[PDB]
Design an enzyme around this catalytic site. Structure first.
Site, PDB file in Angstrom:
ATOM      1  N   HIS A  34    -130.696 -59.138  54.480  1.00 20.35           N
ATOM      2  CA  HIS A  34    -130.500 -58.320  53.294  1.00 20.35           C
ATOM      3  C   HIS A  34    -129.825 -59.088  52.140  1.00 20.35           C
ATOM      4  CE1 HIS A  34    -126.575 -57.024  55.151  1.00 20.35           C
ATOM      5  NE2 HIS A  34    -126.157 -57.196  53.897  1.00 20.35           N
ATOM      6  N   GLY A  91    -119.164 -57.430  51.288  1.00 18.73           N
ATOM      7  CA  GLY A  91    -118.892 -58.858  51.349  1.00 18.73           C
ATOM      8  C   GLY A  91    -118.687 -59.345  52.781  1.00 18.73           C
ATOM      9  N   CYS A 149    -120.593 -58.720  55.366  1.00 22.91           N
ATOM     10  CA  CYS A 149    -121.860 -58.935  56.072  1.00 22.91           C
ATOM     11  C   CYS A 149    -122.087 -60.401  56.397  1.00 22.91           C
ATOM     12  CB  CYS A 149    -123.033 -58.323  55.310  1.00 22.91           C
ATOM     13  SG  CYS A 149    -122.812 -56.571  54.883  1.00 22.91           S
TER      14      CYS A 149
HETATM   15  C1  UH7 Z   1    -120.181 -51.767  52.153  1.00 23.46           C
HETATM   16  C2  UH7 Z   1    -120.103 -52.249  53.578  1.00 23.46           C
HETATM   17  C3  UH7 Z   1    -118.984 -51.975  54.359  1.00 23.46           C
HETATM   18  C4  UH7 Z   1    -118.930 -52.439  55.657  1.00 23.46           C
HETATM   19  N1  UH7 Z   1    -119.907 -53.152  56.232  1.00 23.46           N
HETATM   20  C5  UH7 Z   1    -120.987 -53.424  55.492  1.00 23.46           C
HETATM   21  C6  UH7 Z   1    -121.139 -52.990  54.176  1.00 23.46           C
HETATM   22  N2  UH7 Z   1    -122.348 -53.200  53.484  1.00 23.46           N
HETATM   23  C7  UH7 Z   1    -123.501 -52.551  53.734  1.00 23.46           C
HETATM   24  O1  UH7 Z   1    -123.631 -51.727  54.634  1.00 23.46           O
HETATM   25  C8  UH7 Z   1    -124.635 -52.894  52.787  1.00 23.46           C
HETATM   26  C9  UH7 Z   1    -125.969 -52.512  53.381  1.00 23.46           C
HETATM   27  C10 UH7 Z   1    -126.627 -51.359  52.971  1.00 23.46           C
HETATM   28  C11 UH7 Z   1    -127.763 -50.918  53.630  1.00 23.46           C
HETATM   29  C12 UH7 Z   1    -128.276 -51.641  54.700  1.00 23.46           C
HETATM   30  C13 UH7 Z   1    -127.650 -52.816  55.067  1.00 23.46           C
HETATM   31 CL1  UH7 Z   1    -128.342 -53.797  56.331  1.00 23.46          CL
HETATM   32  C14 UH7 Z   1    -126.500 -53.255  54.434  1.00 23.46           C
END
Ligand code: UH7
Ligand code: UH7
Lengths: 304, 304
Positions: free
Chosen positions: B41, B143, B145
């Site tokens: 992503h 951030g 990820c």
């Molecule tokens: C903001 C955040 C907080 C904690 N862990 C991760 C995040 N980020 C996400 O989730 C961003 C995202 C959106 C939809 C699909 C996917 Cl694979 C990734």
């Protein structure tokens, strides 16, 4: 989102861990620049620990009696000295992995990460608090002595603790990196009393702020209180009295959440008087006090 | 003595963390040998995440669009490929800090350490379990990820997890290092259901054994039970059914304590049916399930 008991990345500290052997005793040392720091009880036998005369014991030892091993290479000891309860072994080689560092004496209630080590090898990392009674509820076995506690500010490691002793009650005692014990403890095999330990009120309030930020708000109520009223409750439940200094450090969390500090105190007062009624906060069924207001801010903003 | 939620020393993993930028999105990558692994992503914009066609999105990208930075030095990208939900960026330089490593798909109920990172920089380390519903209750922000989960066996790092997504419920989802999601999750900005999560029975029993070893024995009773009777109670309390395989891995702890596994089950049954009555076990007011039988053995014996 999510709130974990997070420790600092232990890498800069792993590169400093060495094994120190003196006679038959082996423990961990910290190699910073051309000096190895370890607990002075490395020079004792089991019989010595009952009532050691450390000066007399160290006099029977020479540079060549201290075997310092870093990973798999031996370090040449060219000087030795005792500073309070730590031995400082001067080695002929500066640690190439010496990070930027400081020695700091932390205050009770402050938190730090511990790198538990055996034979100079790291086995684990955990986050803990220096209890108000100057003990730590760690996880240490025989061989762990010399394992250190630290904090990291960008690239600087602030060493604050060195593990020395397990009290007969299973709690742990140690020194700062100048060899001064935190608390009234002495490095001797004698029953030693840790005082009455209290709950770190400011840290519990900081953790309630972390709960509101992460979505656990059930404990928030329609009430407020005063510092004097709250402290009457804190006294009854063996909580540290809350001061205006504590209120001041909770300021950033109060600004972020829009919940005034004294309003959060009223929630804590109701939790103390009524319990949790079978509910949890941040996956915990008790009031957590091992997160300072700074730890909550750092974790909740992603400070690297 | 003492029992802590201990993570592995994170040093070998810190030396692998890089920042990967693609267009306007920045996240963490894992640099092992001459390959950088990160969530796919990274190639999406906020608008793409609603329903991304990753193949079409990756086709608009070239080697030069992936900016990989290790500490402060830039890595030259000479190849790119998508494997399931991970991007593999071939760089012209092998990571000099690449430890001995393996990629492993862990089972639900197994534990691992997480090195939370932002912009390729490590900020913290915590120990967690892969929930039976294949989620993790981590501590991750935007951030984070690309932050990874791992286990360490002497000098070999077994990478088991890469963080990808936070579900609308605040829990986390990610992949193994081959890009296969743990669970039914898809890397898309859509509401996704994590199944009913159960308590990892074998881990709770292992933690009760850790409690007996460390001195917390109040919960031990004069009763015993059978696998079938215990499983009727486990079902009622949403605990994983206990099998003979689980009993077999509890063998070393049963041998060490002299408390037969089914006797420990009877204690757990009484704790489930009666609660803790205001008491704590290993400083916890609830039944802990984030320590496997192997974690209890390792911590209680000081394995480095
Ligand atoms: C903001 C955040 C907080 C904690 N862990 C991760 C995040 N980020 C996400 O989730 C961003 C995202 C959106 C939809 C699909 C996917 Cl694979 C990734
Ligand atoms: C066995 C153990 C477990 C955990 N931490 C530490 C230990 N070791 C000790 O306490 C050994 C000892 C004995 C008397 C005084 C001093 Cl300074 C040190």
């Amino acid at each position: 989102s999510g709130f974990r008991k997070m420790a600092f990345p232990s890498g800069k500290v792993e590169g400093c861990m060495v094994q120190v052997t003196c006679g038959t005793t082996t423990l961990n040392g910290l190699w910073l620049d051309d000096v190895v720091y370890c607990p002075r009880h490395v020079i004792c036998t089991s019989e010595d620990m009952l009532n050691p005369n450390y000066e007399d014991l160290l006099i029977r030892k020479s540079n060549h009696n201290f075997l310092v091993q870093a990973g798999n290479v031996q370090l040449r000891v060219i000087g030795h000295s005792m500073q309070n309860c730590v031995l400082k072994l001067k080695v002929d080689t500066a640690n190439p992995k010496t990070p930027k560092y400081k020695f700091v004496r932390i205050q009770p209630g402050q938190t730090f990460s511990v790198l538990a080590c055996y034979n100079g090898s790291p086995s684990g990392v955990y986050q803990c608090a220096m209890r108000p009674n100057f003990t730590i509820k760690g996880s240490f076995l025989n061989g762990s002595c010399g394992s250190v506690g630290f904090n990291i500010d960008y690239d600087c490691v602030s060493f604050c603790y060195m593990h020395h002793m397990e009290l007969p009650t299973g709690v742990h005692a140690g020194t700062d990196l100048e060899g001064n014990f935190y608390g009234p403890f002495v490095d001797r095999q004698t029953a030693q009393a840790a005082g009455t330990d209290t709950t770190i009120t400011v840290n519990v309030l900081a953790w309630l702020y972390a709960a509101v930020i992460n979505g656990d708000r059930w404990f928030l109520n329609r009430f407020t209180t005063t510092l004097n009223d709250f402290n009457l409750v804190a006294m009854k439940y063996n909580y540290e009295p809350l001061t205006q200094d504590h209120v001041d450090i909770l300021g950033p969390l109060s600004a972020q959440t829009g919940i005034a500090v004294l309003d959060m105190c009223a929630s804590l007062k109701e939790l103390l008087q009524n319990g949790m009624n079978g509910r949890t906060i941040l996956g915990s069924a008790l009031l957590e006090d091992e997160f300072t207001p700074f730890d909550v801010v750092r974790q909740c903003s992603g400070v690297t």
